[PDB]
């Protein structure tokens, strides 16, 4: 059969969860996507010559939250490079996912979004060290320019693929 990967995009409000997801799906940049919108997609894609079903959930910032954390197989942990609080929040999101999953090994990718912006308050060295501390990849993205957007989602799929063989 066809392989299925449930991906969940998490992160503080305004970091670009929706802009990243809409860029992936629509190849369009959204300026004003309502912050209450939770949008989920079932889409067939080809990654590394293997076709799979991606179930992608763009979260909006309690019983339902634990529900989509239980169901999610890999998590895009998004922060914005001009928002130090969103970067500091990553460890809280990570801990909460592991708590809900009741598992210490959850596939994740660290995403630093809005890299097109001049205002940078998160040092890339600290983003690299945070990803290193977690043992996960770190990808710099711009949903405005589409830089790294496909890489971020496809990398998470590859991480789930490796997790399933362990
Ligand atoms: N310059 C720039 N703005 C972005 C980027 N990603 C998102 N935004 C803007 O940040 C605001 C919040 O983005 P949104 O995707 O709605 O954030 P969400 O709350 O995490 O879903 C919107 O005005 C977006 O246009 C980016 O990569 N670059
Ligand atoms: Mg949103
Ligand atoms: Mg618009």
DSSP 93-157: HHHHHHHHHT-S---EEEEEE-TT-S---S-HHHHHHHHHHHT--EEE-BTTTTBTHHHHHHHHH
Task: Judge residue 98's burial from the number of C-beta atoms within 10 Å of its C-beta, 0-12 exposed, 13-18 middle, 19 or more buried.
Answer: middle
Q: Which of 13, 17, 19, 24 to mutate to test the pocket of ligand 1 (most atoms within 8 A of CB)?
A: 19
CB of 111 closer than 8 Å to CB of 127: no
- Give the residue whose CA is nearest to atom 24 of ligand 1: 31
**Residues preceding discontinuities in the chain at C–N > 2.5 Å?**
61
* Full set of structural domains in the chain with CATH: 1-166 (3.40.50.300)
The structure was resolved experimentally with X-ray
> How far is the centre of ligand 1, averaged over its atoms, from the C-alpha of 31 (Å)?
7
Could you give the strand order of the β-sheet that contains 74-80, starting from the edge strand earlier in sequence? 39-47, 50-58, 3-11, 74-80, 108-113, 138-140
Tell me the two tokens of residue 17: 């969860």
Residue 88 CB partners (closer than 8 Å, separation 6+): none
The rounded distance, in Å, linking the Cα atoms of 147 and 50 is 23
Q: Which atom of ligand 1 is nearest to the CA of 34?
A: 16
Q: Is 135 annotated as a binding residue?
A: no
The rounded distance, in Å, linking the Cα atoms of 132 and 51 is 30
Task: Report the SS3 class of residue 81.
Answer: coil
Quick one: how far is CA 119 from the chain centroid?
Answer: 22
CB of 7 closer than 8 Å to CB of 153: yes
Tell me the two tokens of residue 28: 């369009």
Residue 26 CB partners (closer than 8 Å, separation 6+): none
- Pocket residues for ligand 1 (CB within 6 Å)? 11, 13-19, 31, 33, 35, 113-114, 116-117, 142-144
The rounded distance, in Å, linking the Cα atoms of 9 and 56 is 8
Distances (CA, A) of 154 to 5, 43, 55, 100, 161: 11, 13, 12, 24, 11
> How far is the centre of ligand 3, averaged over its atoms, from the C-alpha of 120 (Å)?
24
């Amino acid at each position: 059969g066809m392989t299925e990967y449930k991906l969940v995009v998490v992160g503080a409000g305004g970091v670009g969860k929706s802009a990243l997801t809409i860029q992936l799906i629509q190849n369009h940049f959204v300026d004003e996507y309502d912050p209450t919108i939770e949008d989920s997609y079932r889409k067939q894609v080809v990654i590394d010559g293997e076709t799979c079903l991606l179930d992608i959930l763009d979260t909006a910032g309690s019983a339902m939250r634990d529900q989509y954390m239980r169901t999610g197989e890999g998590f895009l942990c998004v922060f914005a490079i001009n928002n130090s609080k969103s970067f500091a929040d990553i460890n809280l999101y990570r801990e909460q996912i592991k708590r809900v999953k009741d598992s210490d090994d959850v596939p994740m990718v660290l995403v630093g979004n809005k890299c097109d912006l001049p205002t940078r308050t998160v040092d890339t060295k600290q983003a690299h060290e945070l990803a290193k501390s977690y043992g996960i990849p770190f990808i710099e993205t711009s949903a405005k320019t589409r830089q790294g957007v496909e890489d971020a989602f496809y990398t998470l799929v590859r991480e789930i693929r490796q997790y399933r063989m362990k």
